[PDB]
């Protein structure tokens, strides 16, 4: 069957077509990419711009798969993404847990007073409890009288999700499911082995950075900040008086996250606006602009872990990340992220990349594809 994932980002839009296989693997058949215009902080700013930009990437990806695209799996992120842990319970009719006995138990967990500005997009039943038998992941067929569930809720702003959905429908597609950007990137960068000990995946992009914490194989918290790779590009464009279109080229090419990792002999050529000569600038001086901003972006991540570990260690649940912090997304490709993050996070830090991709491994390499390939891992589960 044909499977499609769509990552509408603040900088680039990525579309991926894939095939389902018996063992549970994703054979990617087609890939598409296009720059995104009219998009800020994870949400849209110009609807007509993203409709063309998301049709540009979805048209070159169906050509590269020889099949028309109908249903897609889109991703969305933003500061409105909130995570809630809720508990539900219910009786067990006939002393044998069926599917109805769980939906009624999950229904009680997600029936909360949320409002209307918010809408829930993920409901993740984690651990069940059938009559003093705690720690049960899938209680189908088990015998008992009463069950208890702890369900993880992830909600988002409704109006900021309606704008993203309309851009996909305006192209002639139908959305099958909306996936959180940090949850998809997590589900395609770390392995189940990395989930048992503990991990903290961050998806630093252009508009937003997406945080996900797994301590034991279950999502423990979800938090999103609207400061990312575009807030540091402006820092370059401001401190040196150059356009953002030019300050972005001297960041992708000559960017460094730690000023003590570039020699004093490295010089970069920053242009000038209007038609004036381009003066040479020390790459170390440019790295001295990128470093203080990247450490603040990780201070928000490090203080989020501290507040979550204080709610997990003080609650009788696994709380330590023995595998450290994993950095994915386009902004995690700048020189020195590993050494800049290890200086703020006491734990180890690595940079994740989409793994175990079958075919088309010439465009599914760098970590700015982790979200798009995480939607494929989410659409495989059907
Ligand atoms: N080699 C590089 N060095 C430094 N920064 C880079 C590099 N390559 C890309 N970036 C940064 O990556 C950012 C966008 O990358 P990415 O594809 O992860 O974003 P996105 O998915 O569109 O955004 P979002 O997080 O809003 O979904 C840009 O701000 C750019 O500055
Ligand atoms: Mg992204």
Q: Give CA–CA dist 91/62, Å, rounded.
A: 48
For 246, what's the count of Cα atoms within 13 Å in the CB-facing half-sphere?
Answer: 15
Do 181 and 206 lie in a common domain? no
Measured distance between the N- and C-terminal CA atoms of the chain, rounded to whole angstroms: 12
Do 296 and 306 lie in a common domain? yes
Atom of ligand 1 nearest to the CA of 329: 18
Q: What is the DSSP letter of 371?
A: H
Total domain count, the chain: 2
Do 328 and 288 lie in a common domain? yes
Experimental method reported for this structure: X-ray
Pocket of ligand 1 (CB under 6 A): 9-12, 42, 77, 181, 203, 205-208, 228-230, 233, 248, 251-252, 255, 329-331, 333-334, 368
Q: At what angle do helices 229-239 and 244-252 cross, to 10 degrees?
A: 110
Do 183 and 73 lie in a common domain? yes
Contact 17, 376 (CB under 8 A): no
Checking DSSP bridges between strand 39-40 and strand 43-44, what pairing results, if any?
A: antiparallel
Do 28 and 175 lie in a common domain? yes
Q: Report CA Rg, the chain.
A: 22
Checking DSSP bridges between strand 199-204 and strand 325-328, what pairing results, if any?
A: parallel
Q: Give CA–CA dist 52/50, Å, rounded.
A: 5
Cα–Cα distances in angstroms (integers) from residue 77 to residues 11, 27, 31, 207, 226, in the given order: 13, 26, 22, 9, 9
Give residue 368 CA to ligand 1 midpoint distance, Å. Answer: 7
Q: Give CA–CA dist 21/277, Å, rounded.
A: 57
Resolution in A: 3.3
Range of the domain at 332: 190-362
Q: What is the DSSP track for 315-369?
A: GTS----TT-EEEESGGGGSBTHHHHHHTTSSS-EEE----S-BS-TTTS-SGGG
Among 9, 7, 27, smallest CA distance to 17 is for 27
Do 171 and 52 lie in a common domain? yes
228 annotated ligand binder: no
27 annotated ligand binder: no
Do 278 and 148 lie in a common domain? no
Do 318 and 205 lie in a common domain? yes
Do 151 and 203 lie in a common domain? no
Do 53 and 99 lie in a common domain? yes
Cα–Cα distances in angstroms (integers) from residue 51 to residues 69, 164, 257, 290, 377, in the given order: 15, 10, 34, 33, 25
What are the tokens at 77?
Answer: 């992120």
247 annotated ligand binder: no
Give residue 75 CA to ligand 2 midpoint distance, Å. Answer: 8
User: Where would I find the H helices in the chain?
Assistant: 47-63, 99-110, 158-169, 181-186, 192-197, 229-239, 244-252, 283-312, 337-342, 370-380
Give residue 305 CA to ligand 2 midpoint distance, Å. Answer: 21
Do 147 and 75 lie in a common domain? yes
Do 258 and 279 lie in a common domain? yes
């Amino acid at each position: 069957n044909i499977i499609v994932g769509l990552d509408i980002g603040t900088a680039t839009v990525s579309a991926l077509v894939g095939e389902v296989l018996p063992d549970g693997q994703v054979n990617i058949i087609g890939a598409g990419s296009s720059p995104s215009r009219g998009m800020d902080k994870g949400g849209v700013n110009d609807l007509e711009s993203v409709v063309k930009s998301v049709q540009r990437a979805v048209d070159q990806a169906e050509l590269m798969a020889e099949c028309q695209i109908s249903s897609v799996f889109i991703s969305l992120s933003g500061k409105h993404i909130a995570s809630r842990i809720e508990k539900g319970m219910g009786t067990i009719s006939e002393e044998e847990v069926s599917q109805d006995d769980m939906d009624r138990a999950i229904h009680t967990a997600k029936s909360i007073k949320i409002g209307d500005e918010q809408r829930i997009l993920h409901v993740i039943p984690q651990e069940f409890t059938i009559d003093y038998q705690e720690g049960i992941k899938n209680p189908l067929g088990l015998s008992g009288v009463r069950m208890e569930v702890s369900v993880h809720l992830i909600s988002c702003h409704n109006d900021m999700a309606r704008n993203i959905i309309k851009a996909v429908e305006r192209c002639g597609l139908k959305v099958e499911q909306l996936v959180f950007s940090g949850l998809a990137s997590s589900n395609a960068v770390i392995t189940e082995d990395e989930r048992e000990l503990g991990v903290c995946v961050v998806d630093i992009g252009a508009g937003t950075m997406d945080i996900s914490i797994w301590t034991g194989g279950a999502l423990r918290h979800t938090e999103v900040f609207s400061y990312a790779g575009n807030a540091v590009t402006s820092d370059i464009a401001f401190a040196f008086g150059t356009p953002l279109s030019d300050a972005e080229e001297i960041k992708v090419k000559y960017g460094c996250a730690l000023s003590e990792l570039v020699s004093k002999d490295d010089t970069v050529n920053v242009p000038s606006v209007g038609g004036r000569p381009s003066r040479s600038l020390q790459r170390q001086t440019l790295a001295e602009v990128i470093e203080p901003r990247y450490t603040e972006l990780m201070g928000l991540v490090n203080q989020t872990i501290d507040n979550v570990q204080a709610k997990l260690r003080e609650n009788g649940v696994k709380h330590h990340l023995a595998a450290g912090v994993v950095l994915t997304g386009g902004a995690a490709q700048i020189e020195g992220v590993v050494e800049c993050a290890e200086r703020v996070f006491r734990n180890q830090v690595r940079v994740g990349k989409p793994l175990e991709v079958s075919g088309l491994t010439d465009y599914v390499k760098e970590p700015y594809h982790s979200t798009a390939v995480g939607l494929l891992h989410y659409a495989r589960d059907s």
